[PDB]
């Protein structure tokens, strides 16, 4: 019944960060809105440095994004599983518990940037039961983004 909608730039940034961080698990924060009881809207993400979340970095990035028109709240976090699929480890569950204490609706997204190159994006979204369950993911694309991406694909591969 609940859906996590992921924006175009959110998906590409998570894949990009995950690919650049291979073979490490990299993580970042997801920005957006809990628009109603059934919808999480992930409009953007940002990477966190490799390292225990650096609160100084997070606060600074949030301050600067607000200055350029991105004032959305943290709705969860993402991290990469380079080559071994989407799921939550024990450490991941502990990290997600910390996020859920801050906002009960927080979502944990996991992306596999290695398996994704086989042709289909490998990604999932989780929340804890009180061990965990998968949320449906869908993608939000504006008419302008669709037209841009369609034209880029046609130009590149004709």
């Amino acid at each position: 019944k609940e859906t996590v909608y992921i924006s175009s730039i959110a998906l590409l940034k998570m894949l990009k960060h995950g690919r650049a961080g291979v073979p490490m698990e990299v993580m970042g924060l997801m920005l957006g809105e809990f628009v109603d009881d059934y919808t999480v809207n992930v409009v953007d993400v940002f990477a966190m440095p490799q390292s225990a979340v650096d609160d100084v970095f997070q606060a600074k990035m949030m301050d600067m994004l607000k200055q350029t028109g991105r004032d959305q709240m943290v709705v969860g976090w993402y991290h990469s599983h380079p080559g071994f699929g989407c799921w939550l480890s024990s450490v991941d569950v502990n990290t997600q518990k910390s996020f859920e204490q801050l906002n009960s609706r927080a979502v944990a997204v996991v992306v596999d940037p290695i398996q994704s190159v086989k042709g289909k994006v490998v990604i999932d979204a989780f929340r804890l039961i009180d061990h965990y369950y998968s949320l449906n993911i869908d993608y939000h694309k504006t008419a302008k983004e669709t037209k841009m991406l369609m034209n880029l694909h046609k130009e590149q591969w004709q």
């Binding site: 924006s7 175009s8 730039i9 998906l11 590409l12 940034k13 894949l15 990009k16 960060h17 995950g18 690919r19 650049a20 953007d44 990477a47 966190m48 440095p49 970095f57 600074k60 990035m61 600067m64 200055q67 350029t68 028109g69 991105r70 940037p113 994704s116 190159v117 042709g119 289909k120 994006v121 993608y139 694309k141 504006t142 302008k144 983004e145 669709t146 037209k147 841009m148 991406l149 369609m150 034209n151 880029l152 694909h153 130009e155 590149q156």
Partner: protein, 173 residues
């Protein structure tokens, strides 16, 4: 030392569009930001970007303001994420070169390792080819003196493997 062509990741174009839309830019206004990547070879690779706070006066093209501190503070956060993606120039939403662009470009010369790239991204693209025009500043030679001007460089799209699948995944819904 001579740049001859530019490649651009789809993410950069989508980021410029998201910047334009989230700041409610309309009419003759433009948004402005930084591009990152690698410009140490004849092909400039543009692989990331971020938005800048930017104001300019409606009529007087000589009145404009760009936050130096924002450039530096954000670039340092980008450095902590991926040190290989250097500050290589700037972008704006155009759709065409503006009278202040050579002077703005001089500001970015202080931040780039090489001659800065300006990327104009037409976020109001109707259908005719890539929505981009890429420029570097040069001296142009009457053959008695020279003047600074912009030189258009050809662009193509180049996607990293996973990002290309990301694009196809978005297109397939």
């Amino acid at each position: 030392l001579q740049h001859e062509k530019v490649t651009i990741a789809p993410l950069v174009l989508l980021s410029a569009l998201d910047h334009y839309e989230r700041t409610q830019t309309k009419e003759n206004k433009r948004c402005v930001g930084v591009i990152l990547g690698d410009a140490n070879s004849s092909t400039i690779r543009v692989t990331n970007s971020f938005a800048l706070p930017f104001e300019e006066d409606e009529k007087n093209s000589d009145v404009w303001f760009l936050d130096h501190n924002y450039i530096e503070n954000m670039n340092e956060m980008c450095k902590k994420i991926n040190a290989k993606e250097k500050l290589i120039g700037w972008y704006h939403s155009g759709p065409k070169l503006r009278a202040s662009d050579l002077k703005i470009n001089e500001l970015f010369k202080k931040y780039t390792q090489n001659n800065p790239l300006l990327l104009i991204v037409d976020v109001k693209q109707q259908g005719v080819g890539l929505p981009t025009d890429a420029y570097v500043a040069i001296e142009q030679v009457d053959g008695t003196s020279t003047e600074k001007t912009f030189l258009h460089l050809p662009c193509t799209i180049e996607a990293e493997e996973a990002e290309e699948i990301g694009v196809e995944h978005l297109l397939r819904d």
